[PDB]
Structure formats: C-alpha cells, structure tokens
Amino acid sequence: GAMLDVNFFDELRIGLATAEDIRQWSYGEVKKPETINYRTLKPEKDGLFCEKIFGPTRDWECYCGKYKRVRFKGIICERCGVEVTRAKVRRERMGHIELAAPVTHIWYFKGVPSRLGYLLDLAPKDLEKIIYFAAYVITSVDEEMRHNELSTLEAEMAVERKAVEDQRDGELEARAQKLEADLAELEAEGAKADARRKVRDGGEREMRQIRDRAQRELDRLEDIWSTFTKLAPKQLIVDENLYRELVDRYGEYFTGAMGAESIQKLIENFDIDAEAESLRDVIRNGKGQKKLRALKRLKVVAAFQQSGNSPMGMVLDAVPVIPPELRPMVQLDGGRFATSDLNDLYRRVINRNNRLKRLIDLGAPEIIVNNEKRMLQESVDALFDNGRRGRPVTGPGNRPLKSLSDLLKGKQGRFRQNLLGKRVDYSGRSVIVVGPQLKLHQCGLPKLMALELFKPFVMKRLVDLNHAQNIKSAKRMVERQRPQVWDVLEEVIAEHPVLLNRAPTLHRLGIQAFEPMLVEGKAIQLHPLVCEAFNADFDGDQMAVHLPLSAEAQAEARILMLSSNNILSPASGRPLAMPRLDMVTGLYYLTTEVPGDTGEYQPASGDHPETGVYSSPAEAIMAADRGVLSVRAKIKVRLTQLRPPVEIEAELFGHSGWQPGDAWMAETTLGRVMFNELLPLGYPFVNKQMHKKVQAAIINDLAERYPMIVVAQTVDKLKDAGFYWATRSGVTVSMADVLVPPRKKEILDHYEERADKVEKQFQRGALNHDERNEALVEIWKEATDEVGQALREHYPDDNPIITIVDSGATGNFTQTRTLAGMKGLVTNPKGEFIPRPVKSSFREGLTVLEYFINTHGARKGLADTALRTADSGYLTRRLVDVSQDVIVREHDCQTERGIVVELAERAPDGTLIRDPYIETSAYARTLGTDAVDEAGNVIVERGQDLGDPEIDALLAAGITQVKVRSVLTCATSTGVCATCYGRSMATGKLVDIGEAVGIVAAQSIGEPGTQLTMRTDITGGLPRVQELFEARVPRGKAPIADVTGRVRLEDGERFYKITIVPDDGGEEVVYDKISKRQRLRVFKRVLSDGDHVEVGQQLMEGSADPHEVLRVQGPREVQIHLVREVQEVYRAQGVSIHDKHIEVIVRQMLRRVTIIDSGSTEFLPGSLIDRAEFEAENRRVVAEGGEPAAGRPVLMGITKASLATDSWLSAASFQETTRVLTDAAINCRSDKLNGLKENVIIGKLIPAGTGINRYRNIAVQPTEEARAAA
C-alpha cells in the first residue's frame, strides 16, 4: 500500500513496469516542449511544468485566481484547469509521455549479458540491427498454406524459370546472329584479320555477359525460392530490396516486421513454457557448450517461469515523467535561470515524438518514417542512460548530460552521496583545552555557543517567567543578549547531556556523552583522562558538539554513552581511563622508595630506640609538613583504616580482620600509604612501586570486582593526586641533564678500524659492492647497540629523562639514544640503508651532510603516515560492509560443539608454564564442556565465565585442553546466540540480546592501523593483513604437505625440487618449482632429508595460501590457522585484540558452499550458495528419494563475500547499481529490511540495540501498591 505511505513497513519489493501501471500512475499526458513564458515567468499549458498535471504553484491558488481560499480544497477549476491544493504536490505528481510507436528499454538490451538476447536466443549485435532499424526479421510464417503452395508455387516457379530461360536463349540467339553478322561483315573484306577478330571477340564477350547476367537472375530466382522454403521465425533478412522481392512474389504465407514493434510482436507470440521444457531436457541430457548456454538462458527463463510477471516489460509504450520539483526551474536574484539538464532530454523526446506523430498522420515513405523511429529510439536511450551506446549527448561546454541513471550510479547518486552523511542542526564545534578540575562525567561549554545551542529551550523558559511576553520578544532579547538569559540558561542547561565527537571517528569510543557546565571563555574544556580515548592532543584539534532532543535520545545519552560508563575498551578489555603520562610520573615519584633518605627507620639500639616508627599517618603527615620526614623514606606506621595484604591478614587475624576496626604495623613508606588511601576501603594494601603496568593491573582488577561508579571516583582521585605530585617531582630538562657517554670516541675508533679494513678490502677488489654495503651495515648496527649499552650503563637512575622513560609515561630508549649517543643509520628514499652513517648526537649537533641524510627518512615517514591512514580507513570500510549483520539474536544456541584451547602447555621437565597468549585466547569465553583433572572430579562446570579464579583453579589442577564454546560453532540461523559470544568486554558481564557485535568487531580490528610498521620479499605489515582478509594467494607461497611420512629433501640447480615419500601407497607427492628466493622450514631444527612430515606441514619457509590448506585439512584448521596468522601481526606491535573479534569475520568468510553436482536439485555447477539453504535443500528434496547435490567448502575474500549478499538494496551501494537493479528487477526480488545498512537508508529504526521488538513494545505502568499512595 504505497499510496498514503503509512509508517509501518514489512518488505520493499521491486518489480517491472507495465504501460497500464504507468498510465495509472500518471496525472495527465505532457505534449508540448514548453516550460515557462519568457516575460511573465509563469508555467505553460500541457508542457513540462503544466500546472494542470503537476498541481499548482502556490498554496491553494488556482491559476485564473478566482478560488484562493482554503474552504476550496480538491476542487478542479473549469476555467483554469487546475485542482486547488498545496504546492507540495509538485514533489510527487507523476506524468507520462504517450508514444506513437513502441521503443524498447536500454537496460535489457545493451548491458552485457543482453537479457532480451538471452531470452529470445539471438546474438546481441544481430539484435542491434533489429532494434536500430537496419535489418528485417520475420515474425511468423504459415506452414499448411505454405505446404500446399510449396507444390503449386514450385510449379509456378518452374514455369517462370522456363519463361526466363526462353528469354535467355532468345537473347543468346539474337547476339549469336549479330555475331554471325560480324563474321560475315569481317570475312567479306580481305584485310588484316586481327581487327576482324576483335568484333568477333566482342560479340562472344557480349554473349558471355548476356548468359552470365541471365544465370545471375536465375540464381536470384533459386535464392528467393530456397529462402521461402527455409522460412522460419527469428530469421534475419538483410537486403531489404531482396525482402521487397519476397514481398512481391511470396509476400503471403508469412508475416514480417521490423524494429521495436517487431520485437513486441515476437515476444507476444512467445510462450516460454515450451522453451523452458526444452532447456530442461537439454541440461538434463546433453553436455557441453550448448548445455552451458542453455543454463545461462535458463536462469532468466526459469525466473520468468516462477514469476507471475509478464515478459512484456522490455518494450515500452509510455515513458513516465519525473515530477518537476526534482528537476527545479529555479531562478536567481538577477534573472539567471537554472535547470537540472533533464528538461533538455525530455524536450528532445517530446519533439521527436510529436514529429513522428505528425508524419504518421501525414503518410510518408518508409525511409523518412524509419529514420524518425531510429532517432526517437536513440533519444529514449539517451534519456535513460546517456553514454552507454555510441556517444553521450552533450551540451554547452561539451559535458554529457547527466541522465536518470547518473542520479543513482557512482559516487554522486542517492545511494552513496546522500547516504555517506548529512549535515545536522543543533550542532557546533570549537577548539579544546584541558579541564583538570572537572569530574569525569562533566565537560565545559562556552556560553556564546551554549546560548545558541539551547535557544528554543531558553525561549520557552523566559516566556514562562514573563521576561518576554511573546516569542518574537524572546528572540530579540536573546539576540541582544540581555543579562537575564544567563540565569535562565543555567536552569535550562542543568542535567541535559550533550555529545562530543572528534573527526576522524575511528572506533566506538569516539563519541561520548557529557553533562555540560558553563565556562566563561571561548574553548571547550575537557577532562584530561578521556583524551586517550578521543586520541586528542591539544595542538589545536577541534571537537564537534551535537545535542539530543527527544526523551528517548536523552535517555540513550544518559545511560549508554555516558563517559563514566565507558572505562574499558571493547577491543581488549584493558582500561582506557587509566592515568597517562603526567599523572603517571607523579605517582611514580610518590610511590618510589629511596634508601638513605631523611628520617629513615633504623633499629640502631643499645643507646636509643628506633626513631622511625609513627603511631598514625596523621602523625606522619605532621612530621613531613615539618622539616623532618621525606615522603619516600622507609618507616613503620601503625595503620588502622587500611586493609592489610592477604598473607599478613591471614597471619594475624586468620580470616576475620574487618579493617574498619583493627590495627596493625607495616614497614611501608609514607607515600604508599598516602596513595593507598585513594583506593576503596575493601581493597587490600598494595605496597609496590607504581609502574604503569602495575596501575593497569590495579584498575583492571578493580573494575572486575567493583561497580563502575566506584571505579570512576577512584580514578578521579588518582588523577588529582597524580597532578599534585607531578608538579612537586622536579622533572625538568636542561642541558646539564643530558650527559654524553664518556666512551664514545673509543667505541667509534674500534668500530672505525673494522669499517676501514672492509673498505680497504673492497678497494683491493676482494669483494663486491653489495657485500661491502652488507658488511658496513652489520658493523654500524653492532656499533649502535654497543653505544646504547654504554649510555644506559652510564645514566644514573634519578635523572629526569630516564625517569620519564622508565616510568612508562612516554617514549622508549631509542629516542634517548638519539638525543645523546648516536643517530645510527638513516634510510633511503627507496628504503635501503645509507652506509655512511651518522656518528653524532642532537646534543652535540649534527653537521650539514648528516642533516641532509636525515631529511630523507623524515619526509618518507611524514608522507607514509597519511598514506597508511587512508588505507586503514579503506580496510575498516570493507570489514564493516561485510560484518554489519551479525547481531545477537537468541540466548542459547544449545549445541555441544566448540573449539579447543591450548592453555599453558606442559613442559618437558614437567610443569605448567603459563602460555603468553591467554588474555587474547582463553579469557572471557564460556566453557562448552566441563574440565576434570586426571579422571577425578570436575573443577569448573559448563557455562562458567572463565575468568581469573577459574583459570587459576584449572592451572593448579594441571590441565591444558579445555573445549570452550564459541561462535564459529553457533547454530542459530542469522546472527549468534548470546551464550556463545561470552563476556562482552565493554561491560564485564554477559552480552545482551541486541548488541551489534559485528560493528564492534570491525571497528576493533580496523582501529590499530597507523601503528603497523612493516619491516626495515614476503609481506609482514598492514598489507599482509589486507591480503589475508581478501584471502588471495600470497607472494611468498611456501607450500605445505599433502601426506605424512618421510620426505626426500632434494635440490637441483638454482631452484629446488622436493618430492614426498607417501605412506598411503598412493602416487608419490612431488613438488617442483621451489625457487631459491626462500629458505627451508625449521621445525621442533632444520628440515632434514628423510624427516617425518605431517599431512599439512609447511614445506618451505614462508606463507601458505589458505585455499590449499582448506583443500587438505578441511574446514576446521583453516580457522585455527587464520586466527593465529592475523593475530601474530598485531602482537608484533604490542597491540592486543581479543580473538572473538576476529572470530566473527572468519565465520562470515565460510558461509558458502560451491556446487559441483546440480544433480536433481535446481542448481548450476560452479555456483555458490549458502550452506543453510543447502542444508534445507537436501532435507526437502531428499524426502521421497534423495537427489544429487554435492557441496564443497569454499573460502572467499571479504569483497567477494559482501557482493554475493541477498538484500539487494544494500548490495546497490557498492558497485554496478545499474546491473544490481536490472536482474533483481527480473526476479521480483523483494527485500526483507533485516540488516543494518538498509534501515539507515529508508530512515526507519535499525533492528539492533533499542530497535528490536523485545525492547520496543515495553509497557510502563505504576505498581498498584504505589497507585493507592497517590
């Protein structure tokens, strides 16, 4: 019911037009190529802007001007013709053109494969001659009347040929009599007979051409009779003169036509069922090229068979007209007029159609008429898709006219260019400054921005306080900025959350919601902790503010996207509100311990007591505020309000030390007590030195064991104490605090002698150039590491630079090595090393040549960072477009399958060394089965969350192989069940039943781009990940095994050739073209000759294509390979991604199965279908007899897998929008509106998060025990 357009959609179905549907849509028939009057600027009558068709131009204004009142409504005016209504109906009122002669579509002819040509079984170039009026084609030919006229008109044909032969022999006899006359009138005179033989030869040649021309017209008679006997439908007849011969002699007993109406007659007299059965018989019985052709036609043939849709849609009798508001006839201030280029094409089609109608009522020869038909057909094609066939129609400046299809095609259509994004109201942006007194959920706001933002709210409030009695007075008061608006503005702005966003928005934490508070000034203040999540520096970066309006949207920005409820990154579960550089330096200086400092506790006795002890931290604070104590001494306080560590509390109170009350002694510092009071009351005492890893562990454990509000208040107190002790710590950089190592000249002389010897040996010609450069590279790398060792040995611990480095605040040791020491080696523009190298440090200052050498590497890094940024954006786009449908649907899939987990493999001496990859592989995943240690009891039952205490229990019990339940093995239809996915890391508990895990996975994978350095011919960087998800064959193709047993290591000349000894008794496996660009595989030691191999052991050393490993070891070990292969790349940069994020992508790759046996089930060999359909394929058709359908697992790249989707509306957004529509149009492919890409386009609620029907039909009512209290 797409007439009144109710707000309740179920499906969107695209079909195929008919002339009846078009004339039912239309509100008239445009018949004049007129738009406006040149002087009065009013629309014309029966033109492209005809008001009678496309409604009026002003609100309830008829054209003469009589009826101008809203009391008139829907009343057509007999004087002017129009119906009184709003001017908004010019947006959606349709017109149609009437066509004198039919014209076919351009999409069903020109777009290869030609769908009409496949339907009617013709060549496309030989269909071009039909539809462009250059060849005649016979529609239908009689058979019974032709059958008796075969005999009768063959008698007539023989009689006509006999009369023709009589004419021929009469002409030959007359020419022979003239030849005998030439004989008589040459022979009678006795002269030179050479000229007398010339007239005889001319007469002979004349007789020859007479009989030759007679033979040619006899051949013409034979040809017309032969072709009449060969008369069949779908026969092209070239040479319309010969067609006219067929008309004058054998013009009856058949019907022929020419052109689009001939195609229409052909399709009308075309029953598809007989050709469908014939194609079925051909593909069932035969084989080969004819069977492949029959299948390729049988696609669209069976589509029309299952369809109730007519096959008449290719021809067209009435082009529809787009409403005039979509092609605006705007004018500017200054008499300049602008149109949108469709009016020229429409005007052209109108002119051609009117001229053809005039000629067909006049009566004209067929050359004129068919030339007019041809240019009309070309005009319609130029309207629908300008530039496909021949040449595009251009205009002024020779730009081709943007047709209808270019409003959808490409990057300027209504599938991308208005579906990337749109500008919004209630927005704003400014520069940002640090707000280090704010609480975590707060953010600043300048008043000259917030007044503009909250303008309607403050208008309503200051009307309600009678400062301005009407809205216009309120608006003028706000514009003049009278001083009452601020006291109104605070009350209207309290507890009204706004959003913040910094472009570019990489991942999910890029948009966070904050409660505003007013800031005098011009810059948005910001909490200093969230700059880590926003990736915002303060070099002048600009954030943008939006504003939610509805009660629903304010609820979402208050509960979901609030800044205090996003502490853990969803990629890995590590915190992102952890204190960074400056406060980390503060806490490091606070909690370090210095021996030899003032007022230390010593037990020096026999004369006087210890003089280090203190009764309470209050007394310690008083003493430190005096001159006696330092913060970082070592004392023995008696705490009372801090819970002791577990060992000490077990020693003293056993288990019942309720640390609110009791008292105990501790030999800490003061600073660790002062820092440890910031942590909550239940938390055990720490007593360590607060390196950044330790702070990450503390905040991670705190967020696991405590609520988020406790975590937020704790980390805010941490920020305050961190800044206050950072400014006391005396971190300064001065040139007396950058010490050169005092051994650098000795080190450089010792390496310089070796370099000089190598250069001398190349000077004598003892080696080649690349050996020289390699030896120099090795010498200077050893020298650089030696001087770095000397520097780190020399520097004392309490230096500012090494303190900043060692705390984990920022930087690494290489930057200190360059700042004092040596720069090392600098690369080339190509990427190789310069063998010079730099031997100076930035404290001592470089010289001119060294600065010139350094400039290459600096500029190269500067350009390639932006290049890597663009490529990471591209990768994120592809992954989002693949996995934008995996959302949580059920609660329990209820399977028993699952993957296994390595989990701290057993040592050969025998112990459980903990495996280093557990937090990204084993943490936060539910257990598929139970775990039992040495056939005793179970330790952890099915369904447990598998956190740290379960991990410790399994490790103490001494087991490695658990069988976790996970996605990959999820048995739901679409999307995954909640109990498989495990603990969502952004909450620390189980996921809900609406979470968009696919988009979370895609953003968490694609965000740590721009930190993937490749190396210094096998890919090892970001493009290695890019070819992995595309699953293409890699460059460094190291092959794998195909059977186990011993192997024959074997090398030929300059490239190797290894055969494999089989143990199965089959053919001996032989690998042939092993080039010498690789090395041998090292396993367990080098690959030996006669060494025992596996069925899938990699032969060479490098990479294997996954298609091979799918073919050998099946569908399981590809995923175990593909997870571990990608995850290795991120571990090379110290970046942690949990493996369930990659697990969603690899699940989407293996959805499909190829077809090799269509058998008796409906398919085509070599085609790809979903497994879940293929499961129900051989559960329905195998009832009452199984039918052959052989399926193999196929692994496909992400761009290939996204393209072969099913919701056509989403699929049109990628490429070939003309092609994507034009075959879904044939199949009547109704969409489902179930993904997330399509619901954004048509503006309804997304079916994920607060859009599902569990969470949208919630009824809210007071309880009845509280009803009576009201």
Query: Known binding site: residues?
Result: 62, 64, 77, 80, 537, 539, 541, 893, 970, 977, 980
Question: Is 423 among the residues that bind another protein (CB under 8 A)?
Answer: no
60 vs 653, beta carbon nearer another protein: 60
Q: Which is nearer to another protein, 195 or 338 (CB)?
A: 338
Minimal distance, residue 541 CB to Mg ion, in Å: 4
CA atoms of 299 and 289, how far apart (whole Å): 16
If binding is defined by CB under 8 A, does position 74 make contact with another protein? yes
Q: Considering CB under 8 A, how many residues would be counted as binding another protein?
A: 34
Residue ranges of the annotated binding site for Zn(2+) are: 62, 64, 77, 80, 893, 970, 977, 980
Q: Which stretch binds another protein (CB under 8 A): 75-83, 390-398, 904-912, 989-997?
A: 75-83
The nearest distance, CB 535 to Mg ion, in angstroms, is 9
From residue 119 to residue 158, what is the string marking binding to Mg ion with x (rule CB under 5 A)? ----------------------------------------
Phi, psi for residue 950 in degrees, rounded to 5: -65, -40
What type of residue is 38? Answer: Y
In the chain, the amino acid numbered 92 is E
With CB under 5 A as the contact rule, the residue among 144, 520, 539, 934 that binds Mg ion is 539
1264 binds another protein, rule: CB under 8 A: no
991 touches Zn ion (CB under 5 A): no
Interface residue with another protein among 20, 64, 73, 1075 (CB under 8 A) is 73
Characterize the bridge pairing of strands 542-546 and 498-502: antiparallel
Instruction: Pull the structure tokens for residue 702.
Output: 């705190």
Q: Are 1072 and 1057 in contact (CB under 8 A)?
A: yes
Q: Is 79 in the site for Zn ion (CB under 5 A)?
A: yes
Give the dihedral sign, CA 859/863/865/866: positive
What is each CA distance from 992 to 135, 567, 1254, in whole angstroms?
Answer: 67, 18, 12
668 burial type by CB count under 10 A (0-12 exposed, 13-18 middle, 19+ buried): buried
Half-sphere exposure of 718 (CA within 13 A, CB side): 30
Q: Does 290 bind Zn ion (CB under 5 A)?
A: no
Pick from 46, 261, 325, 541 the residue near Mg ion by CB under 5 A.
541
Residues 6+ apart with CB under 8 A from 533: 509, 510, 512, 566, 569, 576, 577
Among Mg ion, another protein, Zn ion, none, partner that 64 touches (CB below 5 to 8 angstroms by kind): Zn ion
CA angle 1207, 1210, 1214 (to 5 degrees): 130
Q: In the set 15, 44, 60, 455, which binds another protein (CB under 8 A)?
A: 60
Classify 638 in phi/psi space as left (phi over 0), alpha (psi -120 to 50) or beta.
beta
Q: Which residues have C-beta within 8 Å of that of residue 139, sequence separation ≥ 6?
A: 233, 255, 256, 257, 262, 265, 266, 269
Handedness of CA 674, 675, 680, 682 (dihedral sign): negative
* Interaction between residue 75 and another protein (CB under 8 A): yes
Which stretch, 251-259, 373-381, 535-543, 852-860, contacts Mg ion (CB under 5 A)? 535-543
- With CB under 5 to 8 Å by kind, the binding choice for 29 among Zn ion, Mg ion, another protein, none is another protein
Span from 534-542, 1095-1103, 1208-1216, 1249-1257 in contact with Mg ion (CB under 5 A) = 534-542
Binding to Zn ion in span 33-62, by CB under 5 A: 62
Task: Report if residue 332 touches another protein, rule: CB under 8 A.
Answer: yes
Number of neighbours of residue 1114 by Cβ within 10 angstroms: 11
Q: Which does 541 bind (CB under 5 to 8 A by kind): Zn ion, Mg ion, another protein, none?
A: Mg ion
Rounded to 5 degrees, φ, ψ at 1046 are: -75, 165
Site string for another protein, 15-34 (x = CB under 8 A): --------x--xxxx-----
Which of 342, 531, 522 lies closest to 436, judged by CA?
531
Judged by CB under 8 A, the stretch of 10-18, 58-66, 422-430, 562-570 that binds another protein is 58-66
- 71 forms part of the interface with another protein (CB under 8 A): yes
Query: Is residue 824 within 8 Å of 780, Cβ to Cβ?
Result: yes
Q: Which is nearer to another protein, 54 or 1208 (CB)?
A: 54
Query: Is 532 a residue that touches Mg ion (CB under 5 A)?
Result: no
Binds 70: which of Mg ion, Zn ion, another protein, none (CB < 5-8 Å by kind): another protein
Cα–Cα distance for residue pair 1095/1113, rounded to 1 Å: 8
Q: Residue 88 CB, nearest distance to another protein (Å)?
A: 9
Distance CA 337, CA 431 (A): 41
Q: Which does 537 bind (CB under 5 to 8 A by kind): Mg ion, another protein, Zn ion, none?
A: Mg ion
**Site for Mg ion contains 786 (CB under 5 A):** no
Size of the site for Zn ion (CB under 5 A): 10
User: CA–CA separation, 931 vs 956, rounded Å?
Assistant: 12
Q: Quick one: 539 or 770, whose CB is closer to Mg ion?
A: 539
* Among the listed residues 564, 502, 499, 507, the one whose alpha carbon sits nearest the alpha carbon of residue 1000: 507
Q: Residue 150, class by beta-carbon neighbours within 10 Å (0-12 exposed, 13-18 middle, 19+ buried)?
A: middle
In the chain, residues preceding a discontinuity (C to N beyond 2.5 A) are 1016, 1084
**Residue 62 contact partner, candidates another protein, Zn ion, Mg ion, none, CB within 5 to 8 A by sort of partner:** Zn ion
Annotated binding site for Mg(2+): 537, 539, 541
Contacts of 938 (CB under 8 A, 6+ apart): 930, 931, 932
Sign of CA dihedral 1001, 1003, 1005, 1008: negative
87 makes contact with another protein (CB under 8 A):
yes
| Closer to Zn ion by Cβ: residue 294 or 997 | 997
Measure Cα distances from 476 to 110, 455, 472 in Å: 62, 11, 6
- Distance, in Å, from the CA atom of 328 to the CA atom of 342, rounded to the nearest integer, reads 10
Binding partner of 539, given another protein, Mg ion, Zn ion, none, CB within 5-8 angstroms per partner class: Mg ion
Given the rule CB under 8 A, which of 56-64, 207-215, 414-422, 1159-1167 is the region that contacts another protein?
A: 56-64
Q: Which residues pair with 516 in a beta bridge?
A: 443
Minimum Å gap between C-beta 70 and another protein is: 5
Toward Zn ion, which CB reaches closer, 664 or 981?
981
Q: How far is the CB of 452 from another protein (least distance, A)?
A: 20
Under the binding rule (CB under 8 A), the answer on residue 59 touching another protein is yes
Helices (H), 188-239: 193-229
Q: Residue 956: CB partners within 8 Å, gap ≥ 6?
A: none
Residue 329 as a binder of another protein (CB under 8 A): the answer is yes
> Which of 183, 329 has the CB closer to another protein?
329
Q: Per CB under 8 A, which region of 129-137, 326-334, 714-722, 852-860 contacts another protein?
A: 326-334
Shortest separation between residue 1021's beta carbon and Mg ion, angstroms: 25
The single-letter DSSP state of residue 976 is -
Q: Per CB under 8 A, does 902 bind another protein?
A: no
Question: Which range of residues in 55-63, 786-794, 933-941, 1228-1236 is near another protein by CB under 8 A?
Answer: 55-63
Cβ pair 981, 889 in contact under 8 A: no
Assign 666 to helix, strand or coil: strand
Least separation, in Å, of the C-beta of 537 and Mg ion? 4
Which is nearer to another protein, 40 or 937 (by Cβ)? Answer: 40
Task: Note whether 893 binds Zn ion by CB under 5 A.
Answer: yes
Task: Report d(CA 1078, CA 1101) in Å as an integer.
Answer: 7
Q: For residues 3 and 1270, which CB has a smaller minimum distance to another protein in the complex?
A: 3
Residue 87 touches which of Mg ion, Zn ion, another protein, none (CB < 5 to 8 A by kind)? another protein
Interacting residues with another protein (CB under 8 A): 23, 26-29, 36, 41-43, 52, 57-60, 67, 69-76, 78, 81, 87, 98, 328-333, 338
Interacting residues with Zn ion (CB under 5 A): 62-64, 77, 79-80, 893, 970, 977, 980
